[PDB]
Amino acid sequence: NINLFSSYQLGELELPNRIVMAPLTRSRAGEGNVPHQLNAIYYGQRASAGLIIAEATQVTPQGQGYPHTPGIHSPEQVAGWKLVTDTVHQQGGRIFLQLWHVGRISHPDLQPDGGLPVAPSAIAPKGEVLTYEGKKPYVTPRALDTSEIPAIVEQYRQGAANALAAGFDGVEIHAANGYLIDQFLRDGTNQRTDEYGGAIENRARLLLEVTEAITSVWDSQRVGVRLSPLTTLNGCVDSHPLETFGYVAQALNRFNLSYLHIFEAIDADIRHGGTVVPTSHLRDRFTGTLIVNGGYTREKGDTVIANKAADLVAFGTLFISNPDLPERLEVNAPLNQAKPTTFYGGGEKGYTDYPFL
Ligand SMILES: Cc1cc2nc3c(=O)[nH]c(=O)nc-3n(C[C@H](O)[C@H](O)[C@H](O)COP(=O)(O)O)c2cc1C
Ligand SMILES: [Cl-]
C-alpha cells in the first residue's frame, strides 16, 4: 500500500514522502541576479517536501527572460545559492536546481550588450514582454548558427557545475513551457534545416546533448528532465505531441536519469476537445521514476501513486501558500489561499509570511 506519504529511494537520496515542490519562478533575486537570505528562508520553510525543485535559474546571461530571476553562471550566484542549500540541509530537506535558458522569451533590455535573444528559428513571440522599464513589444530572436550549438551545451554544463559547487542535491533540466530546449523540441518553434531541426531525432538533439553534458558533471541519478507535452505557453506547440513526447520519453532511458517530470497542462482537455497525450503513454515508455504535476490534491495524488501511474507528485501553487504543505495534506488541514498579486517580484509579503499550521 503506497500513497503520497510513502518513502521513496531516488538514487542515493531517501525521500520521506512522495510530495515534490514544483519549480516556481518568484523573481526575488538581488543585484547580479544573486540569491540572498530571504530566499534561503523561503526554501528552508518548505524543507518538509520529499524533494524541492528550486525555481528556474538561468545558466548563462543570455538565458534570462524576466527581471530579477536568479542565475547560476557566476561565483557570486553560487555563493548566494549556497546560503539556500545550507538552510535546506540544516532543516533536513533535499533540493534540486532547475536549469534554465529562456531562448526567444526575453528582450534586448535583459540581454548582454542589448543583443538579440537566441532561439532555434527567427520567430518573434506575440505581444509584450516585461523589462526594467515596463512592458515592451517582443523582437525577433536570432536563429543560432549550427556552429554555436556546442556553446549552448557548454553553458548548461557550466550551469550544472555551478549548481554542484553551490551544494544542490541534483539538477532538473527545464525542457518545458516553451523555453529554449522546448523551442528546439517542438515543430511550431523549430523550423531549422540542419541536424537540430526537421526529424524528431534532430529536434530532440539539443535536449539529448545537454543531458549528456550534464551527466558528465553529476551522477545521472541526480539529473532530472521536465517536459510539458500539452502546454501552449509562450507560443510553443508541436503538431504531433504523442509521437514527439513518446519518442523523447524512450530516448531519455539511455541516460539512467533521476526522473522524468511531466507538467500536465490544466487547459489541454478543454482546448483540444480531449487528451492528445495521456501521461500513461509516457509512463509506459520512460522506465524510471515519473513525477506528475498539475492541479493535484491529497486525493488525486494518492490515486496516481496507488494506481502506479506515477511515483512522485509535484505541487506548485499550493506550495506557494502552504510552507508545511506535506503536514497539512497528511492531516487534511485547511489550506492557505495563494495570492497571485505577490507571486512575482517584491519581498517577504506573499513569500515567507504564509503561516504554518
Ligand atoms: C508563480 C509560478 C511560477 C512558475 N515557475 C515555474 C518555473 O520556474 N519552472 C517551471 O518548470 N514551471 C514553473 N511554473 C509551473 C509550475 O511548476 C507548475 O507546473 C504549475 O503551476 C502547475 O502545478 P500546480 O497546479 O500544482 O500549481 C510556475 C507556476 C507558477 C504559478
Ligand atoms: Cl517556467
If phi > 0 it is left, if psi is from -120 to 50 it is alpha, else beta; for residue 113 that is left
The C-alpha cell that represents 129 in the structure block:
514582454
Domain-located, residue 347: no
**Is 244 within 8 Å of 185 (Cβ atoms)?**
yes
Q: How far is the CA of 22 from the centre of ligand 1 (A)?
A: 6
Chain position carrying cell 501521461 = 279
Residues annotated as catalytic are 179
Ligand nearest to the CA of 172: 1
Domain-located, residue 275: yes
Tell me how far apart the alpha carbons of residues 160 and 59 are, in angstroms, rounded to a whole number. Answer: 8
Closest-lying ligand 1 atom to the alpha carbon of residue 315? 26
Residue whose CA is closest, atom 1 of ligand 1? 343
Closest-lying ligand 1 atom to the alpha carbon of residue 177? 11
Residue 152, domain CATH: 3.20.20.70
**Is 58 within 8 Å of 112 (Cβ atoms)?**
no
Listed in sequence order, the DSSP H helices in the chain are 37-45, 75-90, 149-165, 180-185, 200-203, 205-214, 241-251, 268-272, 279-283, 298-306, 317-321, 325-331
Q: Which experimental method was this entry solved with?
A: X-ray
Q: How far is the CA of 26 from the centre of ligand 1 (A)?
A: 10
Query: Total structural domains in the chain?
Result: 1
Listed in sequence order, the DSSP H helices in 13-148 are 37-45, 75-90
Domain-located, residue 3: no
Which DSSP category does 51 fall into?
E
Domain-located, residue 219: yes
Closest-lying ligand 1 atom to the alpha carbon of residue 317? 27
Which DSSP category does 74 fall into?
S
**Is 186 within 8 Å of 232 (Cβ atoms)?**
no
Tell me how far apart the alpha carbons of residues 325 and 331 are, in angstroms, rounded to a whole number. Answer: 10
Resolution to one decimal, Å: 1.4
**Is 183 within 8 Å of 103 (Cβ atoms)?**
yes
- Burial class, 103, CB count within 10 angstroms (exposed 0-12 / middle 13-18 / buried 19+): buried
Q: How far is CA 141 from CA 2, 121, 124, 180, 241, in A?
A: 47, 7, 6, 11, 24
**Is 234 within 8 Å of 186 (Cβ atoms)?**
no
**Residue range(s) defining the domain that contains residue 278:** 8-342
Tell me how far apart the alpha carbons of residues 226 and 21 are, in angstroms, rounded to a whole number. Answer: 13
User: Cβ < 6 Å from ligand 1: which residues?
Assistant: 22-25, 55-56, 98, 174, 176-177, 226, 263, 293-296, 315-317, 343
The C-alpha cell that represents 84 in the structure block:
539556500
Domain-located, residue 147: yes
Ion ligand 2: residues, Cβ under 5 Å: 177
Ligand nearest to the CA of 179: 2
Domain-located, residue 351: no
| Degrees, nearest 5: CA angle 14-10-100 | 120
Read off the amino acid at residue 352: T
The C-alpha cell that represents 329 in the structure block:
495534506
